[PDB]
Amino acid sequence: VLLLDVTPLSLGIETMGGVMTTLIAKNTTIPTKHSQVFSTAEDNQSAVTIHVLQGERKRAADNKSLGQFNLDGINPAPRGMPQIEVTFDIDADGILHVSAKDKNSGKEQKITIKASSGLNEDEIQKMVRDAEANAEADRKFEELVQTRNQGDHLLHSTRKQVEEAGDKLPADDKTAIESALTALETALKGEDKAAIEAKMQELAQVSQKLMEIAQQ
Amino acid sequence: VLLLDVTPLSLGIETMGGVMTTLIAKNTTIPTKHSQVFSTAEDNQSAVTIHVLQGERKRAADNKSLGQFNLDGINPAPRGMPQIEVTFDIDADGILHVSAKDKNSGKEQKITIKASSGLNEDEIQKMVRDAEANAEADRKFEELVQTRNQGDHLLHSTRKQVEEAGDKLPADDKTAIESALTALETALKGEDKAAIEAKMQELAQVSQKLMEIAQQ
């Protein structure tokens, strides 16, 4: 063939922390189909917003918004237990269907995106350019969001373990841990990666008996 | 400057499932330092092997092995709660120190890797070549390992929730769930991504009351 139809930019969805997670990489021959499983961030969450993005930047806000839709009717569950499978499907005509399917409940919602959506040739180029001009800030951004999500995980996990421990936990351990979890929660409200890791480590430093209880 | 000293290939460590996780990207100017936090895969795990890798392939076995060392003395904890911070540090002389530090226990182990370790110019090139010749198989491999680790997570989580539920769970729910967890565990022993997702969904399909109990 003398030609190939390819995606000029990456396609994906916004995930927790405001980061674009890629489902179809830049430069993919179409027709193409890819799927990944995502989940909930909060206990008892009833819905997820799927926000479809085109572009090469790490910040979702820095990419082109192709549309969003909600999947609701997610049944009560602990965070991270629902299996929300997201599929990007680009048919032979260049049309993108994104769907989100709850593997438990069976619910499905889609958005269809025409082949002529997104950035034009000019902007595809200004976009590829910046992904490079800013490769650094993006990396610092992405690792901040990862730290933040790791801190939020440990925040939630440790609180749950404290409950499940209840009386097994000495009051001197419980006072230290709950003070660390307050400072953690205060830090996660910030954009300071080192300060988030300091409170994470503080918590790991005081939680050792908790961990030994939780393991038994 | 007319020259820059740069890393010709990516550097990292082997993580669960046999996948190389990159800590320093190909083409980085040295001196450079980067760190990431990893954790344990099993409850009560006492040690981690750090296995240092150079190269562009997704399978660790497909990369160049720069060395490995263990960090032990990890205190009893639930899986995924320890914070094992791994640092790659390439000084102005081209020497790589990799360290692993337990943020709770304070233990640290390192390996020092001389500047002349790894693949020579020829092999750097044969390596970059294959990362491309095989970009596909690598992606299929990496998403198999991710599915497998997501399935293992849900396997472990659901068993724990069954325990914490105990009598709250109807025996008709508990029989269905424990049968799904047996088939899941049988599938995770395989290299079939679709079969792993089938048992995951089977489990999500039978676990709904469990999820509603676990959330309360």
Partner: peptide, 7 residues
Amino acid sequence: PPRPIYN
């Protein structure tokens, strides 16, 4: 609603 979180 919250954005999906990816494991």
